[PDB]
Amino acid sequence: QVFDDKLLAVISGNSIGVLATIKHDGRPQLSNVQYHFDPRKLLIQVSIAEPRAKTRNLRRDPRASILVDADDGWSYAVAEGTAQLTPPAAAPDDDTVEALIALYRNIAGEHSDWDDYRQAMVTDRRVLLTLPISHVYGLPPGMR
């Protein structure tokens, strides 16, 4: 839809969002995440680390939402989906680290020392979060 494309435009137009996961007690857990939006596949990809609260929540209940703010700093879009998570990075060139490399390119371009990047992924036990967008809602720029 034109709408909603106005919401996706808010998502494709930014890189920082509020990730919302579900605590064991059922209430939301919120944090900021950097992301890359794949408009062709309608995916949102995030790099997260195994021992963080957001990761543990998602392994337990894969349902995730991301709110992205528009340029006006008023309006917003929220993407919902069911997260898919890679295993944590365990070797400097396993498929997980390879995917995180591709993610960092999409977000930040060419890395200074890729080999250190590779080692940090293993060390910090990084995970690729892939979130297929199954529903969008929000208040697109242009209305009340």
Q: Long-range contacts of range 104-113, CB-CB < 8 Å, 24 or more positions apart?
A: 104/47, 106/36, 106/45, 107/15, 107/34, 107/35, 107/36
Q: Does the footprint of ligand F42 cover residue 15 (CB under 6 A)?
A: no
- Residue 96's binding partner out of Na ion, a second copy, ligand F42, none, with CB under 5 to 8 Å set by partner kind: none
Contact code string over 4-33 relative to a second copy, x by CB under 8 A: ------------x-x-xxx---xxxxxxx-
| Contacts (Cβ under 8 Å, ≥6 apart) of 47 | 34, 100, 103, 104, 126, 127, 128, 129
Q: Which two tokens stand for residue 58?
A: 């998602």
- Residue 33's binding partner out of a second copy, Na ion, ligand F42, none, with CB under 5 to 8 Å set by partner kind: ligand F42
Q: Which is nearer to ligand F42, 44 or 118 (by Cβ)?
A: 44
CB of 27 to a second copy, least distance (A): 5
Q: Does the footprint of Na ion cover residue 53 (CB under 5 A)?
A: yes
Footprint (CB under 5 A) of Na ion, residues 82-141 = none
Residue 125 Cα to chain centre, angstroms = 16
